[PDB]
Ligand binder design. Structure first.
Ligand SMILES: NC(=O)c1ccc[n+]([C@@H]2O[C@H](COP(=O)([O-])OP(=O)(O)OC[C@H]3O[C@@H](n4cnc5c(N)ncnc54)[C@H](O)[C@@H]3O)[C@@H](O)[C@H]2O)c1
Ligand SMILES: NC(=O)c1ccc[n+]([C@@H]2O[C@H](COP(=O)([O-])OP(=O)(O)OC[C@H]3O[C@@H](n4cnc5c(N)ncnc54)[C@H](O)[C@@H]3O)[C@@H](O)[C@H]2O)c1
Ligand SMILES: *C(=O)/C=C/C=C(\O)C(=O)O
Ligand SMILES: *C(=O)/C=C/C=C(\O)C(=O)O
Ligand code: NA
Ligand code: NA
Ligand code: NA
Ligand code: NA
Lengths: 483, 483, 483, 483
């Protein structure tokens, strides 16, 4: 299989391809053509021009309707999309069918809907001559949106950015992860078949540094760069767009805590932390790699979680009650296994996991690791502080409400946090004191697409979601009429 | 006069001092103690700590009441602030009495009011178990706000940032321009006398590079850097804070155009462009340095603007009928004059000005220049494309509406634009097509502080004003409760 | 037996039937079963019970999807709705295809979308004990919405109420005009086939006083009454529901002015006033029956309008080039001719029309009248102050801006006004001074469904449209949590 | 003491006067002049004219400043307002000093602030000709606001209506309860002294039927009637303004429940129900006259409440530790006692109270009753369904959560509800299911002035507070410009 770039309405190859690997079994699944600096410039110029074409002339309602057709296009090829994400990543067919693909569709539907309903402001004012003035605001396309997306939730995170971008009338140059190029390529076909004017959506394959990612980033023709990924990659990008003073939107992961209070529903919290630690094999930026549990229930909690964790099925995406697939890649497994060892060096008790499963088949050539639970490390340990991005969590006891708040907040990251308690006063009091963008109480990763989404400190900059996306992906202009 | 730093509730000197010069006559007004890296550190640390003190326990209404007291205090020392601003900058006293100090009061009052009125959002959602969930959002203090302000509208631009910062419950470390430190130092006194808690507001004096400005910018204890200034400085600051992924808010350079259509009120437009080109001696980021005038009225408009410009009184701040003061400094005058000769070299006709007035008194040791009008340059001339930030404009004819829209927009800047026309459709049709953040029709620099303010391209990123400031100077947190 | 009621998911007949007449030729179209008190009761109880059924259990997303299905259902039977509308009202077939039916569908689509986008508010407050409290608001179904609709834009106005009613989770009992029950009956079928649960949407036919309308009005089981129609009927309805303190929403009569300034595009204004006076044979609450023209263009405006008026083709709905159909009924024709005679007795000059066309075919049995223009009446003439609701306007000269504002405003009505001018300041300066709910400048009846729609004085109470409808059709509840 | 009307800038007497009685001891406090129909007409006409005077030329900022001046003037006479409120009604001095007078002040300041911050909307749209259109809304004064207020919270409720009315630039004709005329008369003094232009604020005294109140409602010159009070009185008013189609805003009766769940903080719940039943001697529309307590804690709850209720000090407004003053009047006491008798007749157990205290001093000539608790009545007893408006509650056990929801909602009223529970889920799950406008969890009558305030069913129509008042007291107008 070969995955081409999509530039100015044409699928094109490059002067260099690269392997896309299935991490279930290490087998090559396709050659991906790597866009070069020339092709990137070509994509940007084409997106700039397309702003002055038919796309630019579309009414908000026709634009929305076309976006709903992009979404219809995905629905009609649903299983081809499921297959595509599964292949690239190893994610369980069930996850892909219920989480990834439906959310990608909902992204386009939600922001199309918003594009139609959203409105702006009127401000009246008095003036010395007694005639007054009117200020009104409008939202306009920001211009060319640069999109650089990660491998963990490929289509979901790709469309999270492309959808509001197009809904706001922008054009897009989008660079998916080298590891997960398939679903995006399919989207490009959907765009094309749906009659999205050429130059409106441009797909470019490649890597970061000295490759398509960097080139997009250094290109003066774009108006914004929105990115989800590694915090130091965010910092790099920010420096790159600085001379052009481009608008930036970053969601940059973290080291999230779950907190379980003594008055929690223990069984729900055990199940809740299982999901928050090991979903997508712990390759979500929202996952809890840190857990704090009240001393009075620490041992019981750890016990039940170990039990539930060892019940998880690690195998083929289509395997029966499968719960976990592999890591994205071998490189990523090597980093994760590297932390596995560091955890021991650091004094950790390994409650469960700590290595890789054994298959004695093709999967042994994959990139699987085991769900892991550590105990007994210091709050200052590297394993408790640095983001691992694997199916791992360290559990630690706490005694006081203010103590644990202080411990959750003592981090250079602050994306999300999950809190377990049945007490009303407690839930609201504690929630407002956690220094993150996103709190969940008695649940995790529940997403209403209208809400502001993002992080504090190293975990990001700006917010996306609902009107926050409508604002970020638009020029806000103020028009003042003297009367 | 001696201008001290204000750090953790105390006025402090530093090891080194620099001179504050009166641009009217080149005389020394005061010595200004330069904060060093260690003092910058103390200010940041005090500000972090102040967030955990009494300031952090104030209700929103009590916080607002204290902010109104700050504003009362400025009011009570109104003429001192006027004299301070005038001393530093040479601005006409009547401008300081009607624009500068009044706006600085209004900034505090408006954001104190928004602090009390502003609310957040509630989103209900359905879930699988049929019980649903609530998402609600809150605004919290972002933390410590780094403010770095320019010399052109010292107290106005300073308080424009400090007012919302405080209103949103942050603490502040603020560095006013080395050219214009007096009114900020006075403001510190008002802060102290109003009983603002120690560490909440901190004033550090100095320069940019290798000085208080850069130290502030590099300090990891800050949560945000808000800046109005040269766009190249903005880029530098963006790079400096990138490793911390600090929130940023930039209002930067302009090369703003005024457009005068055939159906304009010609006298009103002449008076209008007079003000937009030469207000504050052209030292406003909003000034018009490019002027496009319909062919059929070009010659008359140019003749009218020449006469009106030659009528401008350039002189002392309290001189009868004075319209224009000097430039901020000799250094800035060197730059302006350099453009003045470059314009000749690029082939400009000098309709008026082009040099420095001769007073034959102490003002000759000052930093005055003449209001200056050019004609005859191409749209590619450096003098038509680069920000001068002096009392200057180039005037060029046009024939067609779409033609002029494209010429205005053909720029790496995009801050503001003023349009002159008596035609209803024209005002609205043209304004929405200008690629800037701010348009005025039949007026200029009319400000409603609730409006979103800011630029596109090199002219900035982000918006401030009204709820845009309430969002930028706050952590926006989403709290999701499973029911 | 032709047009049945639709109660609790079944079409049902009644004890008495009445005739539906085609106003093109006076011929009987259908027999309509008049709901009696018992049946009105049955409808309300069933709507009451439906709230406690699966309709009550839908998530906002599923409820929206269902509403979109109702729209799809109307779309699938587009031509049948056209024929139904045309039959009852005599409206030109092209108007039905481009205005009436498309707007009915748009009504459902818009409010379905808003149901999904709309959110509510979060207010934080401090409390004596220093722990604070939260207030959040929610929208819930108000309950059973009683809908009483008029005959002039039958399906458009019917669905303008039903769409938001259903979108906010209410159930409905709706009574269409005795003159135009067909398209509403067809909607009931669409609702049945779409699977809308029984009790959710109920259709009852009949008259006002001593009939289905009155009884709906007097039933204590409804939660609100929303009504479009005559003013005196609004008053009657307001009194009827008073003992129950039911929520009310009224758009009533108007005696709307168009104002034409000397700087208007004269050709566009003539065409504009031709449409605002004669569209739907002048049977729209937004029609202009008063017209004020600046003296310098009066004679020419009048001559222009007369010519264009006499071009209008009055005839069959499917007649080649037809512009105007008949009036709704013979009884309405008699009212309109009563004013046509009064205008003469009051001294009017009849510029054109003033009687009934003679067709020498079945149309002479229908209810046609001529498009009429009067001149020469005083501002206090009855024909100039009372709503006629036919295809007529009086044209009067004016001289001064403040004069014409006062004359427009001197009315017990205040629904809408149209202003023609090319001057920017004038447009905004004058529009804000007109005492109505709706102003159009250089156009007429341009409708954005997000906008607040309603009148002042006798022309109504409350606003509908956008969030105004989402508010009126919902219980707004504040919930305050002590922390 | 003499209490005059204030009409068109002048205090005036009337042909007839009536007595204002102190309910503590039954003594004459003052003579009140009853406005006749001629004088009401004079007030409304002056109010209409005032809209065209200087009041109408004030900028929003200036109008706001003047309203803050009104508030200052009350603050400067703080204790005279305390004395006036206490004299009229017998309320405890501490309640007047902490709730009543401070709220009146906060009313004016809140709405003054909102006047300055509030803005409106901008809606862009496409058109067939491709040029587009824009819609913008504005808020303007509605006109003359009729205000009719009750005696239970005289200045709080009076200024709750007058503040937003003025803040929205309206003029006012206001009629306080004949039982509590004093504070409103002092406010007329403050208005005069503050320079409020003549006709802007008019104070008329008297009764309802055949007196000033009725005449107000019948006057065609008013634009709206806002009213708080008895439900049947709301109905009578709604009918009276029906012919004019005036805007109406009603907060009316309630028979509010408190619900104590088994997981409640039992002592906090007992204190909270004590306050919600007996504050202001049970004379708040928001008081809980029905109480439901889970079976498992019912006996302990009732014992506890008995004890705390018998601790209450009933007596003089400035008496040491006084909890309750008298009822407003002997007539009102007659009503409440007849309900005391009915409760016994209906089978109630009198847990405490049930009569009148014996003072053996001048308070025996006052209108006091005992705080009263009943038990053992059915949900259909008159004393459980009808509003008594005195210091009483009936307590009933429940078993099931859905059961108690149904029981609370089984009412023709629906003003407020208070729920006691420490459980997170329960607070949010149950609160959204209560059919009222206002829910409190673990508190009572905690008021954020920005929130929507009102009732459902017989308990009112519409909402006030925050933007809801800003909309009700304004013409909302949509202005549509074709471009
Ligand atoms: N927070 C998240 O959701 C998230 C997602 C993916 C990866 N990560 C973190 O990052 C690591 C893996 O990510 P990665 O190394 O594959 O890439 P990366 O996370 O740093 O970045 C993701 C995307 O950015 C692009 N990119 C990388 N470097 C760039 C550069 N210098 N300029 C422009 N674009 C660039 C890549 O092509 C890729 O598509 C993990 O260890 C994990 O901790 C976090
Ligand atoms: N606001 C508008 O757009 C509009 C629409 C139609 C008619 N009108 C005016 O009304 C005049 C008369 O026409 P109409 O009699 O059909 O209008 P109408 O307002 O009296 O009746 C309209 C609707 O209300 C119902 N109704 C009438 N009386 C009622 C009552 N007492 N209680 C409850 N429901 C009642 C009717 O059956 C119908 O459904 C027209 O001449 C015109 O001036 C205004
Ligand atoms: C730049 O020269 C001026 C900036 C002005 C503002 O930011 C303002 O608030 O008016
Ligand atoms: C009255 O005759 C017209 C009312 C029109 C509407 O309500 C509409 O939504 O277009
Ligand atoms: Na791969
Ligand atoms: Na200086
Ligand atoms: Na008919
Ligand atoms: Na009294």
């Amino acid at each position: 299989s070969q995955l081409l770039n999509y530039i100015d309405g044409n699928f094109v190859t490059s002067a260099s391809s690269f392997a896309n690997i299935n991490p279930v079994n290490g087998k090559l699944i396709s050659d991906v053509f790597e866009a070069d600096a020339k092709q990137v410039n070509e994509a940007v110029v084409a997106a700039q021009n397309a702003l002055k074409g038919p796309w630019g002339k579309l009414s908000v309602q026709d634009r929305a309707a076309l976006i709903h057709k992009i979404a219809d296009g995905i629905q009609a090829r649903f299983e081809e999309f499921v297959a595509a994400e599964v292949a690239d990543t190893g994610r369980p067919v069930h996850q892909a069918r219920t989480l990834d693909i439906p959310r990608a569709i909902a992204n386009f539907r939600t922001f199309a809907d918003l594009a139609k309903t959203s409105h702006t402001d009127l401000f009246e004012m008095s003036t010395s001559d007694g005639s007054g003035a009117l200020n009104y605001t409008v939202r306009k396309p920001l211009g060319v949106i640069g999109v650089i997306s990660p491998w963990n939730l490929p289509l979901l995170l790709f469309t999270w950015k492309v959808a509001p971008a197009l809904a706001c009338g922008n054009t897009v140059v989008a660079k998916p992860s080298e590891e997960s190029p398939s679903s995006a390529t399919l989207l490009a076909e959907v765009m094309h078949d749906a009659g999205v004017p050429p130059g409106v959506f441009n797909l470019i394959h490649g890597f970061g540094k000295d490759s398509a990612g960097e080139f997009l980033t250094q290109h003066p023709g774009i108006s914004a760069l929105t990115f989800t990924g590694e915090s130091k990659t965010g910092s790099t990008i920010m420096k790159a767009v600085a001379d052009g003073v481009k608008e930036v939107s970053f969601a940059l992961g973290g080291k999230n805590a779950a907190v379980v209070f003594a008055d929690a529903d223990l069984d729900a919290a055990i199940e809740g932390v299982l999901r928050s630690s090991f979903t997508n094999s712990g390759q979500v930026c929202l996952c809890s790699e840190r857990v704090y549990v009240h001393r009075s229930i620490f041992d019981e909690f750890v016990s039940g979680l170990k039990v539930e964790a060892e019940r998880l099925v690690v195998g083929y995406p289509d395997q029966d009650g499968v719960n976990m697939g592999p890591l994205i890649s071998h490189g990523h497994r090597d980093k994760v296994l590297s932390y596995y060892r560091l955890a021991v060096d650091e004094g950790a008790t390994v409650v469960t996991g700590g290595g890789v499963p054994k298959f004695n088949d093709e999967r042994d050539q994959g990139a699987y690791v085991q769900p892991t639970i550590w105990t007994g490390l210091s709050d200052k340990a590297r394993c408790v502080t640095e983001e691992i991005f694997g199916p791992v969590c360290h559990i630690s006891p706490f005694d006081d409400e203010d103590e644990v708040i202080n411990r959750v907040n003592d981090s250079n990251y602050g994306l999300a946090c999950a809190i377990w308690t049945t007490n009303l006063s407690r839930a609201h009091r504690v929630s407002r004191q956690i220094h993150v963008g996103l709190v969940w109480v008695n649940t995790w990763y529940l997403r209403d697409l209208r809400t502001p989404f993002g992080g504090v400190k190293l975990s990001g900059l700006g917010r996306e979601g609902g009107r926050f996306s409508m604002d970020f992906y638009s020029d806000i202009a103020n028009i003042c009429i003297k009367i």
